[PDB]
Design a protein around this motif. Structure first.
Motif, PDB file in Angstrom:
ATOM      1  N   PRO A   1       0.808  -1.224   0.000  1.00 17.66           N
ATOM      2  CA  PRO A   1       0.000   0.000   0.000  1.00 17.66           C
ATOM      3  C   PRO A   1       0.838   1.271   0.000  1.00 17.66           C
ATOM      4  O   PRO A   1       2.063   1.241   0.119  1.00 17.66           O
ATOM      5  CB  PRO A   1      -0.824  -0.121   1.284  1.00 17.66           C
ATOM      6  N   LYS A  47       9.507   1.154  -0.356  1.00 16.90           N
ATOM      7  CA  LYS A  47       9.660   0.404   0.882  1.00 16.90           C
ATOM      8  C   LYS A  47      11.084  -0.098   0.996  1.00 16.90           C
ATOM      9  O   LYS A  47      11.481  -1.009   0.274  1.00 16.90           O
ATOM     10  CB  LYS A  47       8.680  -0.763   0.963  1.00 16.90           C
ATOM     11  N   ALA A  64       8.569   5.979  20.680  1.00 16.25           N
ATOM     12  CA  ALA A  64       7.837   5.711  19.450  1.00 16.25           C
ATOM     13  C   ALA A  64       8.399   4.511  18.705  1.00 16.25           C
ATOM     14  O   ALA A  64       7.634   3.679  18.206  1.00 16.25           O
ATOM     15  CB  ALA A  64       7.853   6.940  18.546  1.00 16.25           C
ATOM     16  N   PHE A  65       9.718   4.402  18.600  1.00 13.10           N
ATOM     17  CA  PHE A  65      10.281   3.251  17.912  1.00 13.10           C
ATOM     18  C   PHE A  65      10.303   2.037  18.814  1.00 13.10           C
ATOM     19  O   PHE A  65       9.617   1.041  18.563  1.00 13.10           O
ATOM     20  CB  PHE A  65      11.703   3.531  17.438  1.00 13.10           C
ATOM     21  N   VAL A  89       3.672   6.759   3.795  1.00 18.83           N
ATOM     22  CA  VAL A  89       3.508   8.100   4.333  1.00 18.83           C
ATOM     23  C   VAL A  89       4.614   8.987   3.755  1.00 18.83           C
ATOM     24  O   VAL A  89       5.526   8.508   3.074  1.00 18.83           O
ATOM     25  CB  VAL A  89       3.534   8.039   5.876  1.00 18.83           C
ATOM     26  N   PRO A 122       3.794  -2.696   9.168  1.00 22.34           N
ATOM     27  CA  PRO A 122       4.076  -3.561   8.028  1.00 22.34           C
ATOM     28  C   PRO A 122       2.803  -4.028   7.355  1.00 22.34           C
ATOM     29  O   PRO A 122       1.759  -4.180   7.988  1.00 22.34           O
ATOM     30  CB  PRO A 122       4.836  -4.729   8.658  1.00 22.34           C
ATOM     31  N   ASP A 123       2.924  -4.279   6.054  1.00 23.81           N
ATOM     32  CA  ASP A 123       1.765  -4.549   5.221  1.00 23.81           C
ATOM     33  C   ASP A 123       1.152  -5.905   5.527  1.00 23.81           C
ATOM     34  O   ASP A 123      -0.076  -6.039   5.563  1.00 23.81           O
ATOM     35  CB  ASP A 123       2.167  -4.456   3.749  1.00 23.81           C
ATOM     36  N   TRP A 155       6.891  10.848   5.413  1.00 22.16           N
ATOM     37  CA  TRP A 155       8.135  10.610   6.174  1.00 22.16           C
ATOM     38  C   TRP A 155       9.110  11.775   6.099  1.00 22.16           C
ATOM     39  O   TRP A 155      10.282  11.600   5.775  1.00 22.16           O
ATOM     40  CB  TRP A 155       8.834   9.323   5.741  1.00 22.16           C
ATOM     41  N   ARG A 163      10.614  -7.215  11.654  1.00 23.46           N
ATOM     42  CA  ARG A 163      10.885  -6.299  12.759  1.00 23.46           C
ATOM     43  C   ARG A 163      10.262  -6.802  14.051  1.00 23.46           C
ATOM     44  O   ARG A 163       9.039  -6.941  14.121  1.00 23.46           O
ATOM     45  CB  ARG A 163      10.337  -4.910  12.467  1.00 23.46           C
ATOM     46  N   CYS A 173      13.866   0.899   9.940  1.00 26.95           N
ATOM     47  CA  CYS A 173      12.429   0.715   9.824  1.00 26.95           C
ATOM     48  C   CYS A 173      12.058  -0.747  10.005  1.00 26.95           C
ATOM     49  O   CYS A 173      11.022  -1.062  10.595  1.00 26.95           O
ATOM     50  CB  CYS A 173      11.943   1.262   8.486  1.00 26.95           C
ATOM     51  N   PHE A 200       6.313  -9.471  10.179  1.00 28.60           N
ATOM     52  CA  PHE A 200       7.050  -9.610   8.933  1.00 28.60           C
ATOM     53  C   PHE A 200       6.533  -8.653   7.869  1.00 28.60           C
ATOM     54  O   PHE A 200       5.356  -8.299   7.837  1.00 28.60           O
ATOM     55  CB  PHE A 200       6.962 -11.040   8.423  1.00 28.60           C
ATOM     56  N   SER A 201       7.436  -8.238   6.991  1.00 29.43           N
ATOM     57  CA  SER A 201       7.142  -7.256   5.958  1.00 29.43           C
ATOM     58  C   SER A 201       6.702  -7.886   4.652  1.00 29.43           C
ATOM     59  O   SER A 201       6.115  -8.968   4.651  1.00 29.43           O
ATOM     60  CB  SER A 201       8.341  -6.372   5.692  1.00 29.43           C
ATOM     61  N   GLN A 245       7.875  -1.240  18.446  1.00 34.21           N
ATOM     62  CA  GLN A 245       6.765  -0.486  17.896  1.00 34.21           C
ATOM     63  C   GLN A 245       6.967  -0.245  16.415  1.00 34.21           C
ATOM     64  O   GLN A 245       8.025  -0.530  15.855  1.00 34.21           O
ATOM     65  CB  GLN A 245       6.577   0.848  18.606  1.00 34.21           C
ATOM     66  N   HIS A 246       5.922   0.284  15.795  1.00 36.92           N
ATOM     67  CA  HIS A 246       5.880   0.490  14.351  1.00 36.92           C
ATOM     68  C   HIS A 246       5.311   1.870  14.091  1.00 36.92           C
ATOM     69  O   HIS A 246       4.087   2.064  14.180  1.00 36.92           O
ATOM     70  CB  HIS A 246       5.024  -0.583  13.694  1.00 36.92           C
ATOM     71  N   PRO A 247       6.140   2.852  13.774  1.00 34.24           N
ATOM     72  CA  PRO A 247       5.626   4.182  13.420  1.00 34.24           C
ATOM     73  C   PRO A 247       4.896   4.227  12.087  1.00 34.24           C
ATOM     74  O   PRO A 247       4.635   3.186  11.473  1.00 34.24           O
ATOM     75  CB  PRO A 247       6.887   5.045  13.399  1.00 34.24           C
ATOM     76  N   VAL A 248       4.574   5.445  11.640  1.00 32.46           N
ATOM     77  CA  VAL A 248       3.530   5.676  10.642  1.00 32.46           C
ATOM     78  C   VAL A 248       3.846   5.058   9.286  1.00 32.46           C
ATOM     79  O   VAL A 248       2.930   4.717   8.529  1.00 32.46           O
ATOM     80  CB  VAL A 248       3.274   7.190  10.530  1.00 32.46           C
ATOM     81  N   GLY A 249       5.121   4.876   8.961  1.00 36.42           N
ATOM     82  CA  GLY A 249       5.468   4.191   7.736  1.00 36.42           C
ATOM     83  C   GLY A 249       5.921   2.782   8.027  1.00 36.42           C
ATOM     84  O   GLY A 249       5.939   1.914   7.153  1.00 36.42           O
ATOM     85  N   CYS A 250       6.262   2.544   9.281  1.00 34.65           N
ATOM     86  CA  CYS A 250       6.832   1.269   9.664  1.00 34.65           C
ATOM     87  C   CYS A 250       5.797   0.256  10.107  1.00 34.65           C
ATOM     88  O   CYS A 250       6.179  -0.794  10.631  1.00 34.65           O
ATOM     89  CB  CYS A 250       7.846   1.473  10.782  1.00 34.65           C
TER      90      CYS A 250
END
Ligand SMILES: O=c1ccn([C@@H]2O[C@H](COP(=O)(O)O)[C@@H](O)[C@H]2O)c(=O)[nH]1
Lengths: 249, 240, 49, 240
Positions: free
Chosen positions: A37, A180, D23-24, A40, C47-48, A42, B98, B166, B220-221, C40-45
């Motif tokens: 998808p 990504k 946050a992270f 953001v 995961p899909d 960033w 992650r 990330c 997982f991504s 944690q997972h921020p706004v872009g992180c």
């Protein structure tokens, strides 16, 4: 249905993909395969410099690889392993000029850090009597794996989502590729924490599945053109253009 | 497109779903994440005293990652025979990851000395070679824990995600980018003893087993297809 | 106060379960600095998959 | 004035704060006090029987202080290599302190005898020399605790603040004022065994490690700038 009345203008509707001043058309409906998808902006987490959008100039489409595809290419054969934020520059520095002559890529010359989502079209111009089917597949960080040499095959890249180009109907493969990566920015030149793998997102690789099968009197050639739009880009870290080294051949 | 569907030509009536085994066995299995937290052998070593080591000396160091180790097959009959287990077989199917990891390192019986265990997020991973267990000091500011052998000879761990990233690479890593070596392991766990030089001689060639699992933080991504696979019954029998 | 009430009568075991991967609170020794901390997972992180 | 600001010439847009890693990584780090309660090695010794000691005899005594010991570098490869750790590096930045300390002394495996541990707020600290661990009786009215080796060979402690002071000196102490020696350590912890003369001979040259941390009572005083620092990678490699 069932009333084809062709005049001087042919039959079909010519559909547009209007943008900034490069406007390109295809006669056939695309087959997109979006992998992920939309991401953001960033810019809030790691850039305090002037993060400037360039959608008036960078969102133009640009041809980065055309190539001849004949019937002599076998079944499971690569055609082009385009690395897309590189190949936008590699086609330029291959095509006998620097970055400052192409208005798509001058913010790569000025700014040092890049982010952005890509749009990728792989047009074919096959004759209708030809039978064949290319595939286009986006992969993330091909060069950050050693085992892709075991995977670089049509059976591996079929399992992930992938666009298909049938040479029968001369289908076109639009292909949205959102940005990504592990770090949320790709640098554009030699950077104090990594140098090798500059501006690398992964492989756009165009693998043959069905080779050209024609008559004895068949059209052997089948050229394939690849365009790329670069729309939701952000550029940050303004620096001098004399720092920007050439990309790798 | 991959997952498109041109023309369905179904013959079937609609099957009763079991709810992924919840109806029969009383438990679901559709979520693969809840299978991932089942422990799997990470890497088994044999202790080997090289020098008359100081008390500070780490006995072995190893990078910490959910990818599965560089597989070390007198072969170890599990890694000669039971290839890879589960978690790198799933982790083949995802380019990134992650999240946390759990360890539960198990120590042998004849050892008695106290055990210190470190997490070192400073350590990078240089190539897929030397990404295995390494038989080699104690440090201050790294995250530490001592398990006492005399109470219970199995330490447990929740090693967190300390990367400035990330997410991190999940396939086998060739170290292309120089800073990308910072972004594969969670860090580096080191196990060292407080045993003196006289008593550690009895503990030579004793096995130290390490397990692993993800522990609910792992997410997982982007999907990546599987690599080519080896079918395990095709492996040869030991002709006697 | 003297606590003379007779105490519990348990069974020790050396290790938590392994095949259990579900609604089950698992106690460990986290090398994180915070007890309430979770990766944690921020706004872009986010995961899909 | 130090912290004044004459003319800001900012070029930057406002950065998104991560909330100091909350946050992270799911956890804050801005408060340095919550880092201070992470344990650090205090001082590691080697047991050495000098006399055929009585059961009353303390095996070693040491003053108790958050300043870090007089650093005792066959060198100890941690104190030869990993200089000072964390807590005296922060404690360099404050002239005074006031609060509790935690200890968690870890004992070796081959010992079995019972262990008594004392706090002695009577003991002063005479100079920065002899402010280290000292290999030398049991006493009544001092605050005491026995850890049994056979149950678990790691005692833990919450040693309180017993000084008649407003706070205590935190830099390294030269003993200028004679009564000021009452105001540096929290007191003096002594560890002694109940081992007889025959069995303590087996425990010679076994390591006894002591850790430390502050434990929520510590509140540092007036700021003082840092001393000159040594950069650790500049230390030489052991040429072989
Ligand atoms: O071993 C035991 C069992 C019960 N109890 C007490 O018995 C009561 C009932 O036990 P249950 O867990 O509800 C309750 O008051 C407990 O505290 C003990 O104190 N110890």
């Amino acid at each position: 249905m069932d009333n084809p009345n062709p005049g001087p203008d042919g039959e079909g509707e010519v559909e547009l993909e209007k943008d900034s001043n490069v406007v390109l058309t295809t006669q056939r409906d695309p087959s997109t395969s979006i992998p992920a998808p939309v991401s953001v902006k960033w810019s809030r987490w790691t850039s305090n410099d002037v993060v400037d959008d360039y959608a008036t100039i960078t969102s133009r489409w640009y041809q980065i690889a055309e190539f001849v595809w004949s019937k002599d290419d076998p079944f499971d054969k690569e055609l082009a392993r385009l690395i897309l934020p590189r190949a936008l520059l590699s086609s330029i520095e291959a095509n006998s000029d620097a970055i400052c002559d192409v208005p798509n890529t001058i913010p790569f010359k000025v700014h040092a850090y890049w982010r952005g989502d890509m749009e990728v079209r792989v047009q074919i111009n096959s004759n209708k009597f030809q039978v064949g089917q290319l595939q286009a597949t986006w992969y993330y960080s091909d060069h950050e794996n050693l085992n892709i040499s075991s995977k670089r095959s049509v059976y591996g890249f079929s399992q992930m989502d992938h666009a298909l180009i049938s040479a029968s109907a001369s289908n076109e493969a639009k292909l949205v590729i959102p940005f990504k990566h592990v770090y949320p920015f790709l640098p554009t030149r030699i950077v104090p924490d990594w140098t090798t793998g500059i501006l690398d997102m992964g492989a756009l690789n165009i693998r043959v599945i069905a080779p050209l099968r024609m008559s004895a009197t068949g059209p052997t050639t089948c050229n394939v053109v690849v365009f790329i739009k670069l729309n939701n880009s952000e550029f940050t870290g303004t620096s001098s253009g004399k720092f920007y080294a050439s990309q790798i051949r | 497109e991959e997952s498109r569907n041109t023309t369905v030509l179904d013959t079937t009536t609609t099957l009763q779903s079991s709810g992924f085994g919840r109806a029969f066995f009383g438990e679901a299995f559709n979520d693969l994440k809840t299978l991932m937290r089942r422990y799997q052998l990470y890497g088994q070593l044999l202790l080997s005293v090289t020098t008359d080591k100081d008390i500070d000396h780490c006995m072995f160091t190893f990078p910490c990652l959910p990818q599965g180790l560089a597989l070390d097959i007198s072969p170890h009959e599990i890694f000669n025979r039971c290839r890879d287990g589960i978690i790198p077989l799933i982790a083949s199917g995802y380019r990134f990851y992650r999240g946390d990891l759990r360890y539960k390192i198990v120590f042998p019986s004849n050892v008695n000395s106290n055990i210190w265990v470190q997490h070192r997020p400073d350590r990078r991973l240089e190539g897929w070679s030397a990404a295995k267990i390494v038989n080699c000091v104690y440090n201050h500011g790294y995250a530490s824990h001592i398990q006492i052998t005399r109470v219970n000879n199995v330490i447990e761990l929740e090693v967190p995600f300390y990367n400035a990233t990330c997410y991190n690479y999940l396939q086998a890593f060739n170290a292309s980018s120089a800073a990308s070596s910072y972004a594969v392991s969670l860090g580096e766990i080191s196990v060292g003893f407080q045993a003196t030089s006289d008593d550690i001689a009895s503990i030579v060639n004793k096995p130290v087993t390490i397990y692993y699992s993800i522990g609910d933080g792992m997410q997982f991504s982007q999907w990546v297809g599987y690599q080519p696979m080896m079918i395990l019954d095709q492996l040869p029998a030991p002709v006697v | 106060p003297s606590y003379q009430q007779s105490p519990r009568h348990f069974v020790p075991t050396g290790m938590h379960s392994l095949a259990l991967g579900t609604n089950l609170v698992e106690p460990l020794h986290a090398l994180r600095l915070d007890a309430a901390g979770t990766t944690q997972h921020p706004v872009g992180c986010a995961p899909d998959e």
